[PDB]
Homo-oligomer: A and B are copies of this chain.
Amino acid sequence: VISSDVIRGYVDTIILSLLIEGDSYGYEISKNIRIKTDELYVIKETTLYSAFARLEKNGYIKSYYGEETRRTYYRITPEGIKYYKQKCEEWELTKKVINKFVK
């Protein structure tokens, strides 16, 4: 297991990161998180679905709708790509700080 405190800081950035690869939807995103982390991080549904809500409200992603049978898909916005890049730079600084002490 990993730091809950750090991961809380990066949930949105991790979801944005997957959306930069391609448009996606709730179940695919959480599936992709656990698989790509080698099972080290499995995201809670409540964590995931309040993140979408926040990401949308903030204007970092947009919803759209598949065919009726309707699935909600998200696509990352230019404003969401810029938030992602800021958080990437932040992660680099965060790492630099903690690697000094935690060796």
Contact = CB atoms under 8 A, between A and B. Distances in A.
The copy count of this chain in the complex is 2
Contacts of A41: 97
Interface stretch (A54-62, A73-81, A84-92): A84-92
Contacts of A1: 90, 93
Contacts of A94: 2-4, 6-7
Range for the number of chain A residues in contact with chain B? 20 to 34
A96 interface: yes
Contact of A37 (B7, B97, B103): B97
A33 to B, nearest CB: 8
B97 A40 contact: yes
The CB with the most chain B CB atoms within 10 A, among A3, A7, A14, A90, is that of: A3
